[PDB]
Structure formats: C-alpha cells, structure tokens
Amino acid sequence: PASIFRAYDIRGVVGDTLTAETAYWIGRAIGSESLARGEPCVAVGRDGRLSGPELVKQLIQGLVDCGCQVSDVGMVPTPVLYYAANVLEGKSGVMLTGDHNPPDYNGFKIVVAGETLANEQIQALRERIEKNDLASGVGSVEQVDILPRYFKQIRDDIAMAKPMKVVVDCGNGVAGVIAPQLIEALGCSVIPLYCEVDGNFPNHHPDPGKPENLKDLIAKVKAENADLGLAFDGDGDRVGVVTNTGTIIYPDRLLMLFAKDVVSRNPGADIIFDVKCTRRLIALISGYGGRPVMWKTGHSLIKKKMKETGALLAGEMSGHVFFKERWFGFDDGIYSAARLLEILSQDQRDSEHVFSAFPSDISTPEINITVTEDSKFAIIEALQRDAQWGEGNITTLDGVRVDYPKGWGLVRASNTTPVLVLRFEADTEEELERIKTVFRNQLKAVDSSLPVPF
C-alpha cells in the first residue's frame, strides 16, 4: 500500500496497512538503499508500542538479509536512535515508531548515510520492493546498550547554575525510559507524570501540541509550585513547555530563547524555523546578527535544510527543535529540555518572566480545515497562481505566507492529513481579523464551498 509511504516517514495501522511481512520488505528496502550509499551499518530502535517486538524483528531481519550490520539499541526514544546513528560505526538508522498516533499505529523514521529520508526518497523504498531492486547478503546483529552513552553525553555538557523543580509528563510514551532520570541528573527535582511506558496510552495521548494534553501538567506545576513543566510526545522528538504560572510557551517562542543563546556564541549563524513560526523570530535572529532561514514544515525537511545551510539551530512550531551547536543536528525534545533548563537556571527570574520579556503578539492556534486529499495541494496551487496577495512579503516555499509590518498569515497543506493548516498573528486583535478576512476571501475565491472556520 503506497498510502503508508508518507512525505516525512512511513506510518501504517499494524495488521491492516502495516503487517509483519511489509515491515520485513521495508527493512530489505532500507538495507538495500543504505548499501547503495556505501553504508553497511544500521542502528535499529523502537518506541513503547505493543506491536514493537513483533515488527522490529522483521525490520531487523530485512536489514540483515541485505548483508547489513545491525546495531539493535532496543526500546529508545527516537532521538536516541538518531544519536546511535551519529556515534556508532554507521550513519544509518531506523526507528520503529508510531509516535503519538493511536495504539494500533506504527511506522518508520529513517536515516541513511547521514540523511533523513523524505518525499521521493521514501517512495524510492516502495519502488525497490516492487522492482525487487533489493540486496541479498548475510548480515549481522549486535546488541548495543546506547542509553547510558546518550545520558552521559548530555549530562556532561549541560551546566545548570541553580536547582530547579520540574514536572515532567511523558504521556506514557518511551521518553519515560530516560527524560525524568536525565533531567534529575542535571540537578533538578522531577515530579513525574505518566512516565511509565505503556503502549496502551491509558491517560492522555502524548501530544504536547494540543493544550488538552497539557492540563494535568499545568495543574501539577501549580499544585507543587514547580519552576517549569515539560511534556514529551510519544517518541521524544517533540517537547512542550509550561511556565511556573502555567503559561503554555509555544515552540516558536521557545526558539526565540534558544536563538538568543546560540547566536550569542556564534556570530552570523544560520537559524531555521518553519513557516508556522512567529515573524518575531525572524526579527530576533537578525537583530542578534544571525541569519534567519524560513523553511518547510516537516522534521525530515528541516533536517535536510540544516545540512544545506550549516544552521546551528532549527525549530518547528509543532515542537521539534534541532540543535547542531554542541550537538548533532537532529530533533530531540529531551536534549532541548536540557538546553532550556540550562538557560533558565542562569536567570534569577522565574520562567514566566523570562518568556514574558520577549515580544508576544495576538495569535491564533494552528487552525485546520479538513479538505479532500485530492484537492489540498491544488487549493494551495490556486492560491499561489490565482490569488492577488499584493503586497506584503509573500513566501510560497510551503503554502502561502504573507508578512506585513504588524502581522502575518499562513495557509499550507498538511503532509500527514487531508487538511489545510493556517496560523495568523498580529500586534492587535483588529489587525489579526483584517488578515483573517483577506485569507478567508482568498480561499472562498478558489472554492466558495470551502469551510472557513475563522
């Protein structure tokens, strides 16, 4: 089924669209692709899902039947798998994960020879299977215990000044295997919330991008008078943040704090953010002498862009934050949490006042309009072709973004759902609704039937 080969990764329903047999052939396809790039060595990890044991053995056998040398790192967060692919012999790795999709989902995040696959590169794996353009060989499997290396890597490079008390919510995802322990080892007291790994995800699904999944966290932070709240998503490559007073700090505001710190030590450094992030981030980066690079949404696309630009830091609005400075340049919520605590601990102000000090504007959440999968990209192309946007700085690298003096707006197509994704920001509520109006008029110009929920 080509439907499981997605823009950023592979994702399927275990049994239905993703079976044991398909996991094997995906392994052969990846192993074959790795060998074609001259990399026999592949690390393999999995998240906390129930299907993980079943499917990962098939992934591994697929790799091994190509002649690949597999390093099995067991059940780890996604960033720990990316880490393994940076410190072991090979620069390839596959993470078996369904991230924060419902329990029955699983999938693959794939790096081959240092490069995170996306778009045509993921299609190329399906194509190898169909064509039987597959390597055959007698590979090897080695058990590798990678967590302690990861844990010590971070701990030894992080220096907190003051002690902090932190609520850590892992939503019963695999971040529980290390984030509470690592964070404590930095010099914090950790209040654990849903830190037990449970593939059933009994409490709230680990999706920090939705405020409903941060309610328990916010509540505990306040109840325990904690210095900060942290939530990790299913596989640990997203982080969500809450202040001592329960304010949700969206990832583009988090990136402002990170950009200030990275740019400070690294004059001129390129800093990447996706099209969903506040314009205030463009200003800030530039004001500290950095180079802002706006790019496409999607972690694979962002990681590729970091290689093309030499960026020292990237972030997406969904909460993937990619440090190259002092790190390896992959997205990692657990490392980003540590880098955050390091910065906050130097400050005599509480976390609410650190973040409230930066400019904040009136801002919508991410807005979604469900359209048909047939129509979503065409709608955008129509907006790019047909629509007169004047006027503002118009960016078309991913959807249509328009930047004005006192605000901005975005419409893009999701690469994971049949939806249009919108965000609007302005200095004032008045300006915000004026930008909303323009976008609503332009969508209804393409198709008067289109839902416009804003």
Ligand SMILES: O=P([O-])(O)O[C@H]1O[C@H](COP(=O)(O)O)[C@@H](O)[C@H](O)[C@H]1O
């Ligand atoms: O969970 P992941 O690792 O696949 O991460 C991906 O999930 C979402 C799907 O993107 P889209 O807006 O195109 O649907 C994005 O918001 C996020 O930025 C991206 O990295």
Ligand SMILES: [Zn+2]
């Ligand atoms: Zn994730």
